[PDB]
Amino acid sequence: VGQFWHVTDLHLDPTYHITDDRTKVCASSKGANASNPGPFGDVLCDSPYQLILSAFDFIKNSGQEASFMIWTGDSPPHVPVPELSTGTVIKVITNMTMTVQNLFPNLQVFPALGNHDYWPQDQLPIVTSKVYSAVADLWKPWLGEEAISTLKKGGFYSQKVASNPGLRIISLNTNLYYGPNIMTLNKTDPANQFEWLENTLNSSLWNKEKVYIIAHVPVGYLPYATDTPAIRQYYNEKLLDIFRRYSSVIAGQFYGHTHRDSLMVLSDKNGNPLNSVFVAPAVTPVKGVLQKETNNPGVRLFQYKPGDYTLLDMVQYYLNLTEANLKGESNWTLEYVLTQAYSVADLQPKSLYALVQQFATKDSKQFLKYYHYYFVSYDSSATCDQHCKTLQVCAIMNLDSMSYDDCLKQHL
């Protein structure tokens, strides 16, 4: 099998620092006291460099052979806008990129921009900008001339996978569709990305290429909320239309942003599953004061069929933050292998569709395992009542507004 790494939502806090005053440990705790801070971080803080470095060091010495890596964005930390700048955002993105380039000098890496990869956060523009030009220079070792051009202009690109003939990564800037982005309200095709996408998929079809879609913010519905698409409904519907029509060219979709481990199955209006969608959890464990849960840090690995790119498996690795802070050593370890964990043959839309049918059933243990993995095993005492469970299952299976409304109507 071939395989590739997926990391996302690094969220470096350069001010991380263990000290007596726990309000003064990380700017990302937002002046609040870190709750239980260690060298690898705190649930109220974004990532210390030690955390991110231990993640990449684990990948490097994992004994796992991978031919590329996808990196779906969000490197700067959660601090107030006035505490950041264009210069500081570029500095953080540069530090992450150089960390990866130094540690992995021969691995092609496919980054996507996240909503924090810009100053001010979430305001990613539909024309060229300092941040887009900067990341185009930063990621030149991995991208051709045409990808550099589109990235500099709109924050998105496509690129052939050098080590995998017949595979192409499409890296979308889905922050253009993200609710908080006040730069793109009421535009029908912000930065022409839709027209660009269709052109690119059309060319991949005729060059007999397979396509992996990557982006930061995903399609579909936020699984913990009611009727809340991750991106604006209008853009979600239009993107999903493109994905459904090209579902035989697209062999996988990969997203981050939610900081959780979620599955989705893109389906038609009739219940034919068409593509498999994978939302990866964050390296940062950060949470607000009120939130009951957060994720353990996570990195993950995908296995696919050589020269074919059908997804065969996924391996989710994680770091137990409380224990790593307890002993002062990062024990990055196997959380689960998807096929083994859910007893499915592979990751094809059909296998996952049948597995989520099992999820639906009453007191499904499959769904309990899934819910425990949603938080990257942060808390097995976490529970999901039947309202919670309906919201989750309906978001997993129904990506478009009408399938989703029908699911909630029939099952809430």
Ligand X SMILES: *[C@@H]1O[C@H](CO)[C@@H](O[C@@H]2O[C@H](CO)[C@@H](O)[C@H](O)[C@H]2NC(C)=O)[C@H](O)[C@H]1NC(C)=O
Ligand Y SMILES: *[C@@H]1O[C@H](CO[C@@H]2O[C@@H](C)[C@@H](O)[C@@H](O)[C@@H]2O)[C@@H](O)[C@H](O)[C@H]1NC(C)=O
Ligand Z SMILES: *[C@@H]1O[C@H](CO)[C@@H](O[C@@H]2O[C@H](CO)[C@@H](O[C@@H]3O[C@H](CO)[C@@H](O)[C@H](O)[C@@H]3O)[C@H](O)[C@H]2NC(C)=O)[C@H](O)[C@H]1NC(C)=O
Ligand U SMILES: *[C@@H]1O[C@H](CO)[C@@H](O)[C@H](O)[C@H]1NC(C)=O
Residues of this chain that interact with ligand Y (CB under 6 A) are 199, 202-203, 206-207
Tokens 């993107």 -> residue: 239
Give the whole-angstrom CA distance, residue 355 versus residue 183: 40
**Maximum Cα interatomic distance, the chain, rounded to a whole number of Å:** 62
Query: Which residue's CB is nearer to ligand X, number 49 or number 224?
Result: 49
Given a contact cutoff of 8 angstroms between Cβ atoms, the answer to whether 310 and 285 are in contact is: no
Q: Does 333 help bind ligand X (rule: CB under 6 A)? A: yes
Task: Give dist(CA 337, CA 112) in Å, integer.
Answer: 25
**328 part of the interface to ligand X, by CB under 6 A:** no
CA distances to 115, 258, 259, 269 from 401, rounded to whole Å, are: 23, 19, 23, 10
Q: Flag whether 173 is marked binding.
A: no
Q: Pick the closest to residue 112 from 81, 79, 147 (CA basis).
A: 147
Contact residue for Zn ion among 47, 75, 99, 115 (CB under 5 A): 115
- Give residues 317-336 in contact with ligand Z (rule: CB under 6 A): 320, 322-323
Is 6 marked as binding a ligand? no
Question: Contact between 36 and ligand X (CB under 6 A)?
Answer: no
Q: Say which residues have a Cβ less than 8 Å from residue 229's Cβ, sequence separation at least 6.
A: 220, 221, 222, 236, 401
Instruction: Please state the closest distance from residue 66 (CB atom) to ligand U, in A.
Output: 15
Closest CB to its own copies among residues 82, 105: 105
Regarding beta strands 298-304 and 2-7, do their DSSP bridges make them parallel or antiparallel, or are they unpaired? antiparallel
**Residue 273: its H or E element:** strand 273-279
Compare residues 158 and 316 and give the one whose CB is closer to ligand Z.
316
Residues 31-50 that bind its own copies (CB under 8 A): 36, 38-39
Helix, strand, coil abundance in the chain, percent, nearest 5: 35, 20, 45
Count the site residues for ligand Z by CB under 6 A: 4
Chain positions 66 to 105 lying near ligand YA4, rule: CB under 6 A, are 74, 78
Q: Is 411 annotated as a binding residue?
A: no
The CA R_g of the chain, rounded to the nearest whole Å, is 20
The one segment of 87-95, 131-139, 315-323, 355-363 that binds ligand Z by CB under 6 A: 315-323
Based on the shown chain and the rule CB under 8 A, indicate whether residue 160 belongs to the binding site for its own copies.
yes
Is 387 annotated among the ligand-binding residues? no
Among 15, 17, 18, 32, binds ligand U (CB under 6 A): 32
Residue 128: both structure tokens together: 């060229």
Q: Which stretch binds ligand U (CB under 6 A): 91-99, 170-178, 183-191, 392-400?
A: 91-99
- Shortest distance (Å) from residue 198 CB to ligand Y: 7
Query: What would the x/- binding string for ligand X be over residues 83 to 122, using CB under 6 A?
Result: ------------x--xx-x---x-----------------
Binding-residue pattern over the window 50 to 89 for ligand X, x denoting contact by CB under 6 A? x---------------------------------------
CA 292 to chain centre: 22
Q: Where are the strands (E) in 45-179, listed by range? A: 68-71, 108-111, 157-160, 167-171
- Binding residues for ligand X (CB under 6 A): 14, 49-50, 95, 98-99, 101, 105, 137, 140-141, 143-145, 148, 320, 322-323, 326, 331, 333, 377
